[PDB]
Symmetry: D2
Subunit: 494 residues, 4 copies
Amino acid sequence: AVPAPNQQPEVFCNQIFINNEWHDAVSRKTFPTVNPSTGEVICQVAEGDKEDVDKAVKAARAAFQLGSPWRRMDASHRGRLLNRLADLIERDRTYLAALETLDNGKPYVISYLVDLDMVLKCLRYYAGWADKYHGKTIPIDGDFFSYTRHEPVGVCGQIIPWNFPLLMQAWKLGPALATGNVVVMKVAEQTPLTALYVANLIKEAGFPPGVVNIVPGFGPTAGAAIASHEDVDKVAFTGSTEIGRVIQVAAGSSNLKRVTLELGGKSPNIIMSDADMDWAVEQAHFALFFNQGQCCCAGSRTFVQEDIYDEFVERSVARAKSRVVGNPFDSKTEQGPQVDETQFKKILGYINTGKQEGAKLLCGGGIAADRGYFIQPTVFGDVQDGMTIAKEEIFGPVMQILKFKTIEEVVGRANNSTYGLAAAVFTKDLDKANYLSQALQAGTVWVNCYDVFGAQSPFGGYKMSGSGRELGEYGLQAYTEVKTVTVKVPQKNS
Amino acid sequence: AVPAPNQQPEVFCNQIFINNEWHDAVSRKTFPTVNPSTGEVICQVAEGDKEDVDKAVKAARAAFQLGSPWRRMDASHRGRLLNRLADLIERDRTYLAALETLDNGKPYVISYLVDLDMVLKCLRYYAGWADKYHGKTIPIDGDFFSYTRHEPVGVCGQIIPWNFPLLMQAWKLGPALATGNVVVMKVAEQTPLTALYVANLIKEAGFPPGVVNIVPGFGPTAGAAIASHEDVDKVAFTGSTEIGRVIQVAAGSSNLKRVTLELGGKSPNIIMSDADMDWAVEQAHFALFFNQGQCCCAGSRTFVQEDIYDEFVERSVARAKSRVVGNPFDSKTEQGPQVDETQFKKILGYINTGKQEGAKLLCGGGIAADRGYFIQPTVFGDVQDGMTIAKEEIFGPVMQILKFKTIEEVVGRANNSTYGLAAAVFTKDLDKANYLSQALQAGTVWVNCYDVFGAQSPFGGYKMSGSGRELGEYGLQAYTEVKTVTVKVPQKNS
Amino acid sequence: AVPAPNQQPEVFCNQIFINNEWHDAVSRKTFPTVNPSTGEVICQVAEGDKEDVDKAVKAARAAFQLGSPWRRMDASHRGRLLNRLADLIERDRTYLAALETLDNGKPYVISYLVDLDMVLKCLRYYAGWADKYHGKTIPIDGDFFSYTRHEPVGVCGQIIPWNFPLLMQAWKLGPALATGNVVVMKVAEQTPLTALYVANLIKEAGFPPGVVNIVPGFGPTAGAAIASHEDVDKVAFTGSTEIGRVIQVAAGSSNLKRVTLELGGKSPNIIMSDADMDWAVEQAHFALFFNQGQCCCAGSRTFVQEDIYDEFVERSVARAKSRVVGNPFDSKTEQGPQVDETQFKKILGYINTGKQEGAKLLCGGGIAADRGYFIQPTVFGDVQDGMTIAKEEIFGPVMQILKFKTIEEVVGRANNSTYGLAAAVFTKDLDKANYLSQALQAGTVWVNCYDVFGAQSPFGGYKMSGSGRELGEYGLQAYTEVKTVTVKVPQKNS
Amino acid sequence: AVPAPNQQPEVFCNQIFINNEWHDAVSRKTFPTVNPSTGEVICQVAEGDKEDVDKAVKAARAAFQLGSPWRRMDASHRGRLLNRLADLIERDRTYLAALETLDNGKPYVISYLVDLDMVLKCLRYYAGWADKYHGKTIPIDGDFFSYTRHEPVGVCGQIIPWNFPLLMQAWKLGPALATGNVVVMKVAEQTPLTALYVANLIKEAGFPPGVVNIVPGFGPTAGAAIASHEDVDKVAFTGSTEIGRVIQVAAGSSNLKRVTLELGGKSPNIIMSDADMDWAVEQAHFALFFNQGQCCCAGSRTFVQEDIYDEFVERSVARAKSRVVGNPFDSKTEQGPQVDETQFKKILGYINTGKQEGAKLLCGGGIAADRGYFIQPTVFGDVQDGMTIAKEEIFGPVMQILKFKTIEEVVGRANNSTYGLAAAVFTKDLDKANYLSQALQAGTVWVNCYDVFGAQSPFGGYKMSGSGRELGEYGLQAYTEVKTVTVKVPQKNS
Ligand SMILES: CCCc1c(C)c2cc3c(C)c(C)oc3cc2oc1=O
Ligand SMILES: CCCc1c(C)c2cc3c(C)c(C)oc3cc2oc1=O
Ligand SMILES: CCCc1c(C)c2cc3c(C)c(C)oc3cc2oc1=O
Ligand code: NA
Ligand code: NA
Ligand code: NA
Ligand code: NA
C-alpha cells in the first residue's frame, strides 16, 4: 500500500547549511549530482571545501558554548525536537523516498517501506534516549562523594556515505543530538539531496542555529578538512577501509579527536546442510543482492555444506535469473542501478577478474541496459578462498558460492579475513548455532536471517571493518565525554 | 579429589550469636537437633524466642547507626571482609561439609563438591559487588542537579530453610553484607549447626559486632518475632508457600517492612522427541532426585512427548532402581535420608495419594531402611494434570512422568499451575528451545541442562513461587534503599 | 500564558471501562461525585464492586495471553502508542485541566501548568523506555550461555488517590504499559471523572481492548476486590499508611501478589541560618501549602535555626495571610477547597488539637467559606516534637514551625518519625548540604528547593511512607518479572 | 606503621618475559637502569626491540586462540587469579616498595603506603568485575531475539610510564585481564624493574603462559613496534601528548587497532576567597609537589582570588621552604630526586624560562643536589596566562601562582588551554562549587581536595590530555569488543 511516486521530484535544497541558513561555497563552485537510472544531471550542488567546513565548525562551536540555548535546553526537550523532526520526515515521506530513489537508484518501494521507515524508527528511538543516559554515583574509599557526569563530547564531525543516504544521516544525528552534541556533517557527492532536504526540516523542527550544519562537497577536500580540523572533538566516518586509515592518521596528526569508523566487509553467510533450503536460498539472495549489492555487510561469501551444494546453487541461480532489473520507480523492479560510473566500472572489473581466475560463471556477467548503470545479477560458483572475488569487497550484485565439509573448517575459512563486520549462520540445530555465533569474528551474527537491523541493536566491525558501535545504547558511548567529580565530605557513610 | 570425612564431627557452636558473643536463650531453653540418618539426637541448641530476637535487633540497629564502624567502612573493605570469610570457610571446608551431612542428611561428597563450592563462589562473587553498585546522576528538567544514592535498607531479618543450610546462608549474607546492611538471621531448627559455626568465622574475619546476628529456634516463635518486629526494615524468607503468606501478612500488620520470598514449585521438565535420549534421562533423574528431592525447583513434572514415552519411562525406571540409598558418608551413596520425620511422613502420604488416584507406580513407593528417614526412589507413570501428585509440591524422591502431544498443548499444561519457580526444555532444535523458553512462566528456564546455578545469574519465582530475585546484580535490589537528591544550581548545562 | 477555562465543563464519561467499551455496574448502582467548591453533585458515576473487578481482570488476563496483539506488539510500538496518548491529552489539555479543577478543587492555573504539564512529560518519558529496558547476558561458570529476559509482571491492579488524579494515573500507566503489562485501575470516588475521560483517549490512541481497564467505585468494595483477587499479579497503591497495611495483608492473604506503596509522610523542611531568607520563606510556603496541603510529601515540619527564627516566622505569616483562598477557576486564587467533607472535618480537628496543646496559632485556624470545603491558611509556631500536629499527617493547609540550634540536633529530630517520604535543606554551605542529605532518612532530599519532580528521578518512601520507587528507570522495576534462561553449549569461550 | 626498608634490595628479574619465561633480547643487547638518588647504575636489563615484540605478540595471540585455557576459563576464575596476584604483591610488599624507590626515587614511605596500597586496591577491584560486565538482551522489532556478548578485544599492547611504574601496570593489567584479554606490555627504560618482578608473581599466581608478556626496551623501538604491529588489536599509551600523536598515527597506518591515551595536563587548582585557608594551602602544596612534581594531573596552575592572594602566597612559600628534600629511604624525606638527568635539566630549563619572562621567583630556583637529581621546591608568583611556565607541562617541583578576581573570569582562563585532565575548586559555598565543577573542561574535578583516586572512579582527559577513561566500570569499555547476535524466532512476545 505504497503511495504513487512523483517520478520527477523537484529539488529545493542544494546549498551548504550553516546556522539554519543556506549558503554557496566561498569559491562559488558547484558540482553536478546525477540520476543513475538515466545518466542525466539532476541539479548543481554547492561544492564545499576546507573554508566552508571552517565556517561550519565555528557555527557549531558557538552553539555549544556554555549558556547557549542548546546547552541549557532540558534533555527531555532534545527528545521532543527529535520526535518533531521524525513527524516532519513522516509528513514528507512520499517526497523523500522519491528523491532518494532519483538520486541513489534504489527501488522506490524500498525507499518508502524500508529506508524511510528505518529513519523514523531510528530518530524516535534516540529521542527516547535523550534524558536516560545516566552518569553514576560511586562508592569511593575515604570521606568523599564521587560521581560522574556524562557530558556531550562537543563538536562532532560526521562523514556519511552514499549507499543509505537518509538512514545513515539518521544513525549519526540520532545519538549525537540525543546527547547534546553539535554536528558538522559531510554528505556524499553521489547522494547529497535528501540530507539537504532534511536540513530544511531540522530548521522547521526548531533546532537552534549551529546545532546541525551540513557541508556537501568532495572527500579529499571537505571530508579531510573535518578529520584534520583542530576544534573538531570527534569524527565518525562510514566508508572504505582505505579511507578509514586516512581519517585515523588525520586525527592523530591534528588534535587527537576521538574516532569511530564503520568500514568494509567480506561477510560470510554459512549454510549448514540441515538448514531450511527454501528459506536459506531466499535469504542468501537477499543478503547479497539487497540495495544493488551496495551494503558493507553484504553476504558476499556464501559458504554451503557439500551435501546441499548442488541444489542450493541451482536454486540460487534460478532466483538470480528471475530478479527484475529496471526502472526503480516501477513497482515490479527489484534491482535499480549502481550509484555511479565509478562503481559501475569497478564492479565490471571484478566480474572480469572472476571469469579470469577460474570462478565458474553461472549467470549474468554483463551490462543489463543501454542507459544508466545497470548490472546483471551475477553468480559465481566453485569459488576458492585465494580468489580475488572471495577476498575483496565488490559492492555489487555479484554472488560468490563456496563449498565446505565441516564446521571446524568453515570457521577458520570464514574468519580468515581482515574484515569482520558481519556474518550469518543458517541451521536448525541449537548447538551449531551457538558454536558458530560464538566462534565467528564479526560485530553482528545473524542466525537464520540476514540484514536484520534495529535501532535497539548495536552494529559495527571487528578487525579492520571498523571500531566503535553504532545504534542501541552503545551508539551513545562515543558521543559522551565522562567527567568525574569528587567532593570532600565531613564524614562518609554507606 | 574429596578428602575423607570425620563421620561424627564435633560441635563447637550451639548458642545464640549477638554482638560477636555467644549467649544462651533468656529462657535457657534448648532443643535437640537430630541426625536424619540415624534418628538420634546430635546435641542441644539454644532455643531463641521473642526476647532473644529483640536483643538481636537492638544490636543490629546499633551497628547500623550513622557514624558507626560498619557505616563508615569503605565499600571496598566490606568486600575484603567477605573474601576473608570465604577464605575461612575454605580452610574449614572439610569440617563444614561433614557437619552439613550430619545435620541435614545429604551425601558428603555433594556437601563437599557442590554446596561448599557454591558457598565460596557466592560470597566471592558478592565481595566483588560491594563497591560497584552505582547510583545514578540524572538529567532532570530545569536548573537542578539530581542524583541517586543506593543506601542499605537497614536491619534485615533473614529466615533460612533446612534444605541448603550453608548455601542459603551465603545467598543472603552475600548481598546483604556487600551493600552495607546488618542482619538478624533465623536458622532452621532441623539444621542450625553449620550456620552457627560460620558465625564464629564471621567473628574471626573481623566484622564489627552486631552486623551479623544469628538466633536458632522455631518458626512460630523466633521467625514470627522477626517478621512482626517494628524495627526490622526488611525480611527475607525461603520456605513453603503457606508460611510465605504468614510472613507477608505479618509484614503488613506491623511496619510495612519490605518482603522477598522464595517459595515452592512444581517445575516442569519438558522432553521433546528430538532430545538426546541418554542425556535427557540422566538430567531428568538428577532434576527430580537431587538432594533427596528436597529442592524447591525440583523437576517434579517430567513431561515427555508421546513418541519417546515408553522408552523414556523404561530407562528412567532402570536408573531409579539403581540409585543407591544409604549412609551419606559412604562415597557410593547417591541418596541420603529425608531431613526429618515430618517430611518422611508427608512423603509417604503423597506416595499413597498417587496410588489411590490411579497413577501407575513403576518402582519404589515404600520405606527404604528400618532406621533413619529413608525413602525408596519412586516413579509414577501415566500421571495426569488433575492428580494431586501433579499439582502439589512433594519435596521427596518421587518422580511424576506425564505424556504430551504438541508444543502448544505442553505450554498450556506446564503453565497451568500457581507455581513458577523453574522449568526446563530438552531438544536439539533451536526454534523449540526459543519458543519454550519465552512461553514458560518460570523464573529460570534451563535448556538441555537442569539445576545449573551460578552466583552471576538471578533466581526466583513467578506467581506463588515467590517474589524478587536472589543472585546476580538482581540480588542487590532488595537490599538497597534509593534516595534521590535534587539540588538547585545557578544554571544547568548539558 | 494560560487559556481561559470552561468553568462548567460537560461530562462525557461516567461508566466502567472494560475492553474499550463502557458498562454500567452489574448492580446498576451509581454514586455521586461532588464539586468540593460548591458541595453540589456534578453527576452520577457507575459504582464498581467485586463482580465488576472480576470482569475487568478477565478482560486484562485475555489481553495478556501469549500471542495476543498486545504481547506480540513491538516494544517500540508500545512507545508510539504512549506518545499518541500524550498527543491526545495535549489536544484536550484545557478541557482536562478544567474537569480536574471541577472534581478535585485545585486551581485551574495549577491544573493546566503543573498537573497536565507533568502528565504529558511522564507519558512521553515512559514512551521512551518501552524498547530500552534490557536484560543481561551473564558470564556464568561452565559450558553454558546464560541471560535474562525482562518480561511484564502481568495483570496490574492500580489504586490511585484523589489528590493528583491525572498525574498519579500517568505515573502508574507510564511504566506499566511501557513494559507491556495490562492494567486494572481503581480510581478515587472523590475524583473519578478525569481518569474516565482519559480512558476514552486510550481507546482513540489505539490501545488493544483489555490492556487498560478502569473501575470507579469505593475502597472497601472495588479496591479490596483488586487487592485480594486471585488472578492479579501486582498491586500498586497510593494513599494512607493505614490502608497500605490493609493492602499488604490482602496480598499475603490471597496470592502473594507483588506490592508497591506510596503512603503518607511528615516531611521535615530544614532552614539553616545561612539560607537565602526570601528564597527559603517562599519555598517553605510552597512546600506546605501546595495543592491545599494535600501532598504526601508536604513540608509539614519546618525546622528553622534559632538565629533567623523570628524573622522567618514574621515573613512566613505575612505570606500565609496574603494567600488568596477562593474559586479555583479565578486566576488570582492560590488555594481552592479541600477535597471533601471528611478531610475538611479532620483538618479542623487537627487545628483544634494544636490550639489546645499549647502551640502558638499565628494566623488563620478556622473555616474560610460557608459553601464547600475551604480552610484558612493556618500557621502554628513554637511547635514541639511531641505535639499531635508535629507527629500526625494533617493533609491540609496547616504549617508547623519548629525551632532548632545545632545540625546534630535537627537530624535526630527530623529522623525521629515512622515516616520518611521526603525532606529538604536550605543552606549555602557545601558541607552542611552534604551532611544533611546523607543523614536524613527520606526517599527524596531537596536542597534549596522543594517539590521538584521529574519523570527522570525516582520518588518513594523510607520506613512507613512506602516501599518501591516510582518514576525514573526505578519505576520500571516493580513492573518487570525477571527470567533467567541458561542453555548448555558445546564449549564456552570468553 | 611502615616496616624498615632494605635500602639495597636485590634484583632477580631483568630480562624479557614471554610465555612465563625469561629470555634475553634476540640482539643480546642490554641497557643500564639507574638509581636517580645516586646517579649510579643498579643493573643491566634486556633491551627488547621489534623482534622481541614480534615474539611476544605471537605468544599472546596463541594464548588467545579459541579453545585455549585462557579463553575457556570461567570469568569468575579470572577474578580468582587477580586476587591471588594481589595476595602475592601483598606478601612481597616491603621488597616491592623498596625496589620502586630504588629505581624511581619516590620516598619509600609513599611507595609503601600509597603506591602499593593502590596497586592492591586496583587489582582487587578489577578482580570483582571479571564476571560482572554483562552484555544485553534487546527488545528488537519483529520476530527476533537479539543480544550482545561482551568479548575481549584481543591482543592488547600496553605502554606504561616511569612516574607510577607499579600503579600504572596495575591500572592496565586490571581491566585487561578482568575482561579476558592477553597483553604485550612495554615498560619504561627508567623504571623497568618493579614490573619485571611482578611478572614473576604473575607466573606464580598461575596465569597461563602468553597471557601477560613484558618487553623492556626503548620507546622508538619496542614502543613503536607495538603501535605498528599488524596483529595487535588495541594499544593503550600513557605519556606525553607529543608521543601520543605518534601512536594514533601508527595505529591508523597499520591495522586500525583501537587506541586510548592518557597524556599531559596543566591542571588548574582554583582557590576562592571563602576557602578554608590552611586546608587549601596544604592541598595546593600537595597538588603540585606530590611525586616530585611528576604527575600528569599536577595542580600547576594555582589560581587564587585577589582578596586572599598575599596571605596564601606567604603560607605557600613557607610550606615550600619547609619541604624536606633528600634520600628517599630516610623517613624524614618528603621529596626524592627527579627520575633522570633529562627531566632534571628540562625542569631547570623551565625554571630559567620563568625567571626570564617576568614571573616573580619566591623561593627555590636551582639545584638542591647534583648527586642524584634533586631540585629545590620552587614557587613562582604573579604568573600570567601567556607565560611559558603557565602553559607548558613542567613535570617538576615548580609552583605557578596566579591571581584572579571573578568566578566568570577564572573559568575562561582555566579552560583556555589545550589540556583538560584534572581541575580543583576550593570553596565552602555550594553554588560556586556546583557552577565550577560543571563549567571546567576537565576529566576529573576535585572539590576541596586533590589527587583523590579510587579504583571505582574513572580518570582520563578532555581535549589533548587524552581519550578514553581508566578505572571504574568505564575502564572496561576499551577492553571489550561488542558482538550482536540476532536470531529468528517462531513468535516474539514481550
Ligand atoms: C531457593 C533455592 C533453593 C535451592 C538451591 C539453592 C539449589 C542449589 C543447587 C545446586 C548448587 C545444584 C547442583 O542443584 C541445586 C538445587 C537447588 O534447589 C533448590 O531448591
Ligand atoms: C505519590 C505522590 C503524590 C504527590 C505528587 C504527584 C506531587 C506532584 C507535585 C508537582 C508536580 C509539584 C510542583 O509539587 C508536587 C507535589 C506532589 O506531592 C505529592 O504528594
Ligand atoms: C595517568 C595518571 C598518572 C598519575 C597517577 C596514577 C597518580 C596517582 C596518585 C595517587 C594514588 C595520589 C595520592 O596522588 C596521585 C597523583 C597521581 O598523578 C598522576 O599523574
Ligand atoms: Na546521484
Ligand atoms: Na537435624
Ligand atoms: Na469530587
Ligand atoms: Na631508574
